[PDB]
Design a protein around this ligand. Structure first.
Ligand SMILES: O=C[C@H](O)[C@@H](O)[C@@H](CO)O[C@@H]1OC[C@@H](O)[C@H](O)[C@H]1O
Ligand SMILES: O=C[C@H](O)[C@@H](O)[C@@H](CO)O[C@@H]1OC[C@@H](O)[C@H](O)[C@H]1O
Lengths: 765, 761
C-alpha cells in the first residue's frame, strides 16, 4: 500500500507521496474540470465511452452533475458514484473527483427545496437561522455525492441597478460578514469529511461595477476596498475557516481579478493565511483573452490565472490544459503547478474521498426543508409602510391584482433551479413545467386562508400592454381592498428583469406595473402593495398613493403562505432592510455608513430635484406591535485600545401582539486620523417579545471590532470618543450614549475579533 | 539698502535675506489673507482704520479686492494701490500683497467681459483661442493690480449630475490637459512679472464625488487617479509651469485633500517638481474641523493643512494665525513655516512686487473682449441633431418660446460676476443696472430682422403651466417654433446648475420638457436650443424635434452666436467634450471605457436602457459634409520612445465653408493591464472652404501613450496600437495600426504629454 492510500498517514504525508508519483499530465488534470452533462448518454446514465476521453488522466472537479443534467437526486447520486468508480478503478492513481453544485438558495437541482434569496436571508437578521438552513443544505448535497457549494455571495451591494443584488446580503460589511460566517459554518461544519466546502464569491468588488453593469470595472480605492469589500471575505477566511474562494469577473483599476496575484495570493493566502482552493468563476480564465484582452492566447490566460493563484479552472478545462505545454517549453516552473495540485489534493484527502468516494443511492432522496424556508420567508418580509390598513380583517373582499400574484415562476430567484435552467432551454421542457406545477402559489395561499377574492392579472412583468388594466380596475371597485402584487421575473435571459446579466438603470418597477398600481389607487379603494422583487425599486411615485407596502424579496416556494400569514397578522412582520431604498436611480449611491461629507450635497444638503436621504433607510422595518427601548447601560465608560465595552438596553413589547424586534447597534466616531462613518452597524440581535414582555439585549463590543485603516494603511484603534446609537433602524435610533478609548494609539496586528457578541438576559423586576 | 530690497540680487538671495529678518508673527502673516471688503469704508474707499488692525504685520494675499467690493475697475485699482502703499510704507518690512480674483470666464468683477463657460471653451477644441482669451484676461487683471486668477478648473467630469460640470473642460483627460495648458500659458505668459499666476483647481478628484454631490467623497483608485484625474494637473505643472494649485474640498478614501501630504507635497512637489504656491480652497482648512471632523480645533486644522503643503489659507486668516502658537508651544518646527513662507516670498519677488507694486489708475479701464467671447461662442455651440431644418431661411415666421430666449440672466455661468455675486439693496440695484447692458437672445433676433413672436412658455423652475397655451397658439401661427430651454446657473436654491446645485435625475428643469413636448404636438417644425451648464436627458424629446443646438452657458456673446448659427451666417463646428447620458441611471458613460466598460455582460444593454450615451464624446454636426481619405501611418514599427506620423486628408465636399474637428483615438489590447478600446490622444480644428481639401498631421511620440502597469510603473510596452481618426468618438472614418517593437520601456523623468497637430497642403 502506497503511503497516499494509507489513512493512518497524516494528510501532508499522503499529499507529498501522491504528488511525487504524478506525471505532469496527471498534475495538470487535477487543476481542471468537466461538466456533469458531458459524462451522460441520451438516457442520463454514466457513459464509459465519454469518460474514457475526458477522465483518462483523472480530473479536479465535476461541474454540477445534478444541476447540469436535469437528473433527480437518486439518478444524480448514481451518476456521481459511476464517475467516482471510473476514476478510482480505471485511472492509474485512482484520485477521486470533487463534485461542486450551486447551492446559494439550496442545492440547485431537481428535488432540492427553494429557500428565499440571499437578500431575504439577510433581511431576517438571524444568522443562526441561516446556519440552520445551510446545515440542511449540507446533508442534501452530501446525499448526491456533492462536496462543494458555490455559495455564499459576500459581495457588498450599494448599487441596486445591479441584477445580482438579490444574491447579496446587502450594503453593510458587518451584516454581510455576520450572515456569511453563519452560512459557511452551516455548510462546512467542523470536520469537512462530513460537510460541504463553502465557496465565498466573487473575490472581490464585483457588486460595485461602473454604472451597476455586470462584469464592468470595479474601481475601488484601498481603505474602502479593505473595510467594505474585503472585510466579509476576511471574516469568512479567518473566523469561519472557509475552504474555497471564487474570483470576480471584474477588473479592479486595470487588473482583472482572475489575473491579480496581489489579490488572490498576496491578500488571500499571504496576509490572511487561506489554505483552501481558489476556483475560477466560470470561464474567468478564458475571458482574460476574449473579454479583458490582456492574454493573447489560452496558454497566456492559463499562466496569468495560475500565477494569480487560481487552482481550478471551472466549469471545464479549456486554458489549464496548456499548463503542460508551458512547463514542457520552459515558460513556467513545474513547482508552480505542484503548489496548486498540493492545495487540491489536501482538500480531497480532508473530504475523506480516498477512504470513501461513494454514497448510498438508496439514501439519496432529498428531504423537503419547506419548514426552514417558511421560517426564513416569515422573518424576511419587510413592512416598509403601514397607515394601519394591515393586518387586514379576513371578512374584507380582496381584489388580488398583478402579475406576481398569479405566476409562481416569479417567486423564484436567479439560482433557483427551475428559473436558472431556463437559460439552457433558451422532454426537458415538460420536466420543468411538471416541477413548476408543484410550487404552492400566492393564489393557493389566499384560497387556503379562506379569503373571498377575485384575481385580475392587470399586466405582465414586461412590455407596455395596458389592456388588462380595465379588468383590474373593475374588480378593485367591487372589493373592500386591492392587494397589488408586482415586481420581478428573476433569471439570466432577456425576458427577466433582475438576476445575473439583468441590470436596471432607472429603477422603475418593470413594464407598466407602476401605472397599474397608480390606476388601481385612483379608484379610491385601500391599496396594499406587495413587491416580489430582487432589488430595491424607486417607490417615490407610489408611496404616498398606497396604504401599506410589503417588500417580499424573491421568497421561493414558501412565499405565498408567508405573504398571506403577514397580511392577516397570523405572523407579525419582523424583517428589516439590509440595503437602502433610493428615491431614484440618480440618487445612487445611498447607504447608512456615509462619512460626514457623504449622503449630502454641500451646502444646500439636497439635490436640486431630489432629497439626498433614501426613501427607506438601512435597518427599516415596521411591526404590528410597538417596542419601547429603555435603560441604556455602557460599561465601562473608558476602555483601553484592546479592551471591551458591554452595552445593554431593555426592550419591551408595549403593544397587543407578540412580535420580534431586530435591535441594531450603530457606532459613530469623529476626530480619528481619517474620516469615519457618522454611524455604521456594528451589532444586532433579533429578540422575540410576547405582548408586554421585556428583555435585556446585551452587546459585548471588543475594540478589535472598531478597528479601521489610518493614513499609513495601518489597522488601528485610536483614543477618543465613540458614539453608541441603539434602535429599530439606522434612522429610528431610540437610545444614545458614548464611551472613550483611553491610552496610546494601537496598531491591531495578527488575529483580532470581527464581531460584537449579542445575547439576551432577563430585564430587572 | 537691505539685500532683499536690491533688485540686482538674485531672487534666492533676496528671499533668504528677507526670511532671516522676519519675526514668527510676520512669517505666519504671509500665509494668510484678508477680504477686499474688510479694507473699505461704506463708499468703497480704502480704510486706514481697518487696515491698521488687519495688515499691521503684513499679509499673504488680498482676496477679491474687485470681486468682493462691487467696485468698477478704476476704483478697484485705487483700492489695491492704497492697500499696497499701506503695506510698503506702514509695515516694518514693507512686503507687498499678492492680489487674487476669480477669472475662469474672465476677471469676475464689474467691467470684465463675460466669456463663455469652460465647458463651452472645451467644445471649441481650439486651445490657441483659449490661450488668446486668457492673454486678454491677463491684461484685464494686471490693470486692477491683480496677480493671481483662481483658474482653470482641471477636474475631469464624467458625472453630469454635478453642478460644477459647466466649469470643467469635460470627460477627456487629454482634452482637459490640452485646454488647461493653453489656458495657463495665456494667463501667465513667459515672464510672470508681466502676467498673472494661474491656479489649477481642485487638486484632485473633486468632479467624481459620491452620487455627483458637492464635497462628497471622491473614492478613486490609483491607476485611474493617475491617468484620469492627476494627468491634466501633471501637464499644467510640467509643461505649462503653472505657479499655483488649489486643493479639493473632498476626501479621497478617508483623507481630506486639504490634510493630505501624500497628495499636496509627495505627488505635487516631490514627484512633479512644482515650485509655486498651494492655496486653500475657501475655508478648506477650517472645515477639516467643522465638516470632515478630523481636527478638534482650529490649531489642529492649521497643523494638518501646513503639514499637507497648503502655503496660503484663503479667503481670510482663520486657522493659520494659530501657527504662531503651535511654534511657540513646540508643537511644530518653525522650519516648516519657513518652507511655506519661502514659496510665497519667492513668487512675490518673481511678480516684481518689491520693484513696483502699483498700477496707473488712469490706465485701469478694462477693455471689452466681446470679439474673443463671440469667436468662442460661435465655435462652442454644438449641432447635436439636424434633420435638414437648419439653417432656417430668414423669411420664415418664428415662434420664439421658452425662458432661456427671454432672460439674459440665464446666459450667465456660475463664475460670471453678475450671476455669482447674487449668492450675497445698493448691491441688488447695481447688478440690475449692469445686467441691462448684456445683449439678449431677443436683441439678436431683432438685429437679424427676423419676423417672430415671443412666448415665455414657462420658468426654468416650478410647475406653472399657465404660459403653455400662449406658446402653443403662437407656434400654430408660425412656420417654425424655436424652443429655448435650460438652466439658471449660480450658487443659490433658485439655480438649477452651478456650484452647490447638483441634479440627480437629469430632467430639464421645471416643466421645460413638457413645454417642448406640447409645442411639438402642434406638428410645426421645432428647433430645440439648450442653454445649459450640464448634459440633460433628452430621451423624451430627441425623436420629437427636428434639430437640437447645445449652447453651453455662453455669457454676453450668446444671443448673436445663436442667431448666427440658426440662419447659417456661422456654420456650427462645436464638438461634445462630455458624453450625453440617455438617463441618470446610465451614469457614467464616457468614450474611453475598458473592454468590460460601457456595456452590461452578456446582453450588452441594461434591461431598460441602452448602455451607449445618447450623444457620444466628440459629437457635433455641420451644415456641410467632410470626407476623410488617405490615412497614412509612418513608420509601421516604432521603438518604445519613437514617434509615428499620422496623416489624413479632409475635404469639405458640401456647399458651405465650415470647420471640422478631426479627432485621433488610440486603442490598445494585450498590454499588461486593461486599456481603453479608444481614447482621445490628438485633435485639430481645420477650416475648409466649400470644395477645399487639406492634410491634417498628428506627430505622436510614444511618451504620449504611456500608461501605468501592474507595479504602478509608467510604461510603453511592445505591441499594436490602433489608430482611429474621425468626426466623433463614434463617427470614426479611417482606421489602421502601428506596432511598438523592442523591450518594455519604463518612462522616467520628463516625457511628452501631447500629440503635435497641424495642417499641410
Ligand atoms: O448556468 C450558467 C452559469 O451560472 C455561468 O455560466 C455564469 C453565467 O451564467 O456565471 C457564473 O456561473 C457560476 C456562478 O457560481 C457564478 O456566481 C457566476 O458568476
Ligand atoms: O465666496 C464664495 C465662494 O466662491 C464659495 O462658493 C466657495 C464655497 O464656500 O467655493 C470655493 O470658492 C473659491 C473658488 O475658487 C473655488 O472654486 C470654490 O470651490
Amino acid at each position: 500500500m502506497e503511503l497516499y492510500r494509507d489513512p493512518s498517514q497524516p494528510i501532508e504525508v499522503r499529499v507529498r507521496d501522491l504528488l511525487s508519483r504524478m506525471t505532469l499530465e496527471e498534475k495538470v488534470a487535477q487543476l481542471g474540470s468537466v461538466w456533469g452533462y458531458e459524462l451522460i448518454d441520451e438516457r442520463g446514465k454514466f457513459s464509459r465511452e465519454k469518460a474514457k476521453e475526458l477522465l483518462k488522466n483523472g480530473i479536479g472537479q465535476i461541474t454540477r452533475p445534478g444541476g447540469s443534467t436535469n437528473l433527480e437526486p437518486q439518478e444524480a447520486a448514481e451518476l456521481v458514484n459511476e464517475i467516482q468508480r471510473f476514476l478510482v478503478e480505471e485511472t492509474r492513481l485512482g484520485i477521486p473527483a470533487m463534485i461542486h453544485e450551486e447551492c446559494l438558495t439550496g442545492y440547485m437541482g431537481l428535488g432540492g427545496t427553494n429557500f428565499p434569496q440571499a437578500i431575504a436571508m439577510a433581511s431576517t437578521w438571524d444568522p443562526d437561522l441561516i446556519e440552520k438552513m445551510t446545515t440542511a443544505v449540507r446533508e442534501d448535497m452530501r446525499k448526491i455525492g456533492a462536496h462543494q457549494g458555490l455559495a455564499p455571495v459576500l459581495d457588498v451591494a450599494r448599487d441596486p441597478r445591479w441584477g445580482r443584488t438579490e444574491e447579496t446580503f446587502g450594503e453593510s460589511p458587518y451584516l454581510v460578514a455576520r450572515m456569511g460566517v453563519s452560512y459557511v459554518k452551516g455548510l462546512q461544519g467542523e470536520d469537512i469529511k462530513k460537510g460541504v466546502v463553502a465557496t465565498v464569491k466573487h473575490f472581490a468588488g464585483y457588486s460595485a461595477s461602473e454604472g451597476g453593469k455586470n462584469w464592468a470595472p470595479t474601481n475601488i480605492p484601498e481603505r474602502e476596498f479593505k473595510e467594505v469589500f474585503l472585510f466579509p471575505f476576511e471574516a469568512a477566511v479567518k473566523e469561519a475557516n472557509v475552504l474555497s474562494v471564487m474570483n470576480s469577473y471584474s477588473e479592479i483599476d486595470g487588473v482583472p481579478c482572475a489575473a491579480n496575484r496581489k489579490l488572490l495570493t498576496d491578500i488571500l493566502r499571504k496576509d490572511w493565511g487561506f489554505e483552501g482552493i481558489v476556483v475560477s468563476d466560470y470561464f474567468a480564465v478564458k475571458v482574460l483573452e476574449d473579454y479583458h484582452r490582456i492574454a493573447r492566447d489560452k496558454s497566456e490566460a492559463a499562466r496569468l490565472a495560475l500565477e494569480a493563484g487560481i487552482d481550478v479552472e471551472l466549469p471545464k478545462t479549456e486554458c489549464y490544459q496548456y499548463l503542460k505545454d508551458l512547463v514542457e517549453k520552459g515558460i513556467i516552473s513545474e513547482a508552480l503547478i505542484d503548489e496548486a495540485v498540493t492545495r487540491v489534493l489536501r482538500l480531497k484527502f480532508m473530504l475523506g474521498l480516498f477512504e470513501n468516494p461513494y454514497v448510498e443511492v438508496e439514501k439519496a432522496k432529498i428531504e423537503s426543508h419547506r419548514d426552514i424556508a417558511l421560517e426564513i420567508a416569515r422573518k424576511s418580509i419587510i413592512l416598509l409602510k403601514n397607515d394601519g390598513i394591515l393586518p387586514l380583517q379576513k371578512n374584507k373582499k380582496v381584489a388580488l391584482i398583478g402579475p406576481n400574484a398569479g405566476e409562481v415562476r416569479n417567486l423564484l430567484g436567479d439560482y433557483m433551479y427551475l428559473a436558472h435552467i431556463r437559460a439552457l432551454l433558451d422532454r426537458l421542457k415538460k420536466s420543468i413545467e411538471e416541477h413548476m406545477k408543484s410550487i404552492p402559489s400566492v393564489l393557493d395561499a389566499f384560497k387556503e386562508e379562506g379569503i373571498e377574492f377575485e384575481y385580475a392579472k392587470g399586466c405582465e412583468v414586461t412590455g407596455e400592454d395596458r389592456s388588462g388594466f380595465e379588468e383590474a380596475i373593475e374588480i378593485a371597485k367591487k372589493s373592500d381592498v386591492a392587494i397589488v402584487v408586482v415586481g420581478d421575473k428573476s433569471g439570466l435571459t432577456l425576458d427577466c428583469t433582475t438576476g445575473e446579466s439583468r441590470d436596471m438603470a432607472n429603477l422603475k418597477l418593470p413594464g407598466v406595473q407602476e401605472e397599474l398600481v397608480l390606476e388601481v389607487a385612483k379608484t379610491g379603494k385601500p391599496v396594499v402593495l406587495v413587491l416580489i422583487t430582487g432589488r430595491p425599486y424607486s417607490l417615490k411615485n407610489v408611496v404616498d398613493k398606497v396604504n401599506a407596502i410589503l417588500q417580499v424579496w424573491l421568497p421561493g416556494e414558501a412565499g405565498g403562505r408567508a405573504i398571506v400569514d403577514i397580511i392577516y397578522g397570523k405572523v407579525n412582520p419582523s424583517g428589516k432592510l439590509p440595503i437602502s431604498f433610493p428615491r431614484s436611480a440618480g440618487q445612487i449611491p445611498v447607504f447608512h455608513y456615509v462619512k460626514p461629507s457623504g449622503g449630502r450635497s454641500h451646502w444646500h444638503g439636497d439635490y436640486v430635484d431630489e432629497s439626498t436621504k433614501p426613501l427607506f433607510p438601512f435597518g427599516h422595518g415596521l411591526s404590528y406591535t410597538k417596542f419601547e427601548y429603555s435603560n441604556l447601560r455602557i460599561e465601562p465608560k473608558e476602555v483601553p485600545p484592546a479592551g471591551e465595552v458591554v452595552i445593554k438596553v431593555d426592550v419591551e413589547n408595549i403593544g397587543d401582539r407578540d412580535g420580534d424586534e431586530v435591535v441594531q447597534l450603530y457606532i459613530g466616531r469623529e476626530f480619528a486620523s481619517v474620516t469615519r462613518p457618522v454611524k455604521e452597524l456594528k451589532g444586532f440581535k433579533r429578540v422575540s417579545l410576547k405582548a408586554k414582555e421585556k428583555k435585556t439585549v446585551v452587546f459585548r463590543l471588543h475594540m478589535d471590532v472598531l478597528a479601521y485603516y489610518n493614513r499609513d494603511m495601518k489597522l488601528v484603534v485610536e483614543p477618543g470618543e465613540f458614539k453608541v446609537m441603539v434602535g429599530s433602524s439606522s434612522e429610528d435610533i431610540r437610545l444614545t450614549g458614548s464611551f472613550s478609548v483611553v491610552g496610546e494609539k494601537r496598531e491591531v496586528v495578527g488575529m483580532r475579533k470581527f464581531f460584537t457578541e449579542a445575547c439576551e438576559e432577563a430585564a430587572a423586576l
